[PDB]
């Protein structure tokens, strides 16, 4: 599909057997999701943006379905104000910017 940018590009995602709303974010290197209890091992990480840094938990090879498009890769989990789908998964669903 084509998504205009009049409003936040929020879409439904499926991760760990749960449906969530997440931002399709070309400005995010990696996907970061609001705090959630994912099983498995993880590695601590810090990501920086407007306002400074937050501490997140990096999970690898996590399966996410974005608008029926399946993807698998790194998913960060931490105190983000919004669920964010980053370029690491946007490339996997064939997402492009167009103007």
Ligand X SMILES: CC(C)CN(C[C@@H](O)[C@H](Cc1ccccc1)NC(=O)O[C@H]1CO[C@H]2OCC[C@H]21)S(=O)(=O)c1ccc(N)cc1
Please report, as ranges, the residues that interact with ligand X according to CB under 6 A. Answer: 23, 25, 27-30, 32, 47, 49-50, 81-82, 84, 86
Q: Residue 46 burial by CB count (10 A; 0-12/13-18/19+): exposed, middle or buried?
A: exposed
62 binds, among ligand X, a second copy, none (CB under 5 to 8 A by kind): none
67 binds, among a second copy, ligand X, none (CB under 5 to 8 A by kind): a second copy
- The answer to whether residue 5 forms part of the interface with a second copy (CB under 8 A) is yes
Q: Which two tokens stand for residue 10?
A: 């929020």
Instruction: Pick one of 13, 64, 77, 90: the residue that binds a second copy (CB under 8 A).
Output: 90
Asked whether the beta carbons of 78 and 54 are under 8 A apart, the reply is yes
User: Least separation, in Å, of the C-beta of 80 and ligand X?
Assistant: 7
Q: How far is CA 80 from the centre of its chain?
A: 11
Asked whether the beta carbons of 33 and 20 are under 8 A apart, the reply is yes
Asked whether the beta carbons of 75 and 84 are under 8 A apart, the reply is no
CA pair distance 62, 40, nearest whole angstrom: 10
Of 17-46, binders to a second copy (CB under 8 A) are 23-29, 32
Instruction: Pick one of 17, 37, 48, 61: the residue that binds a second copy (CB under 8 A).
Output: 48
Give catalytic status of residue 60 as yes or no. Answer: no
| Residues acting as catalytic residues | 25
């Amino acid at each position: 599909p084509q998504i205009t940018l009049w409003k936040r590009p929020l879409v439904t995602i499926k991760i760990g057997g749960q449906l969530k709303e997440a931002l399709l974010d070309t400005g995010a290197d990696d996907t970061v999701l609001e705090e959630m209890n994912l099983p498995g091992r993880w590695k601590p990480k810090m990501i920086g943006g407007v306002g400074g840094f937050i501490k997140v938990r990096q999970y690898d090879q996590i399966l996410i379905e974005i608008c029926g498009h399946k993807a698998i890769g790194t998913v960060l989990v931490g105190p983000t104000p919004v669920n964010i789908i980053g370029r690491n998964l946007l490339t996997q669903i064939g997402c492009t910017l167009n103007f």
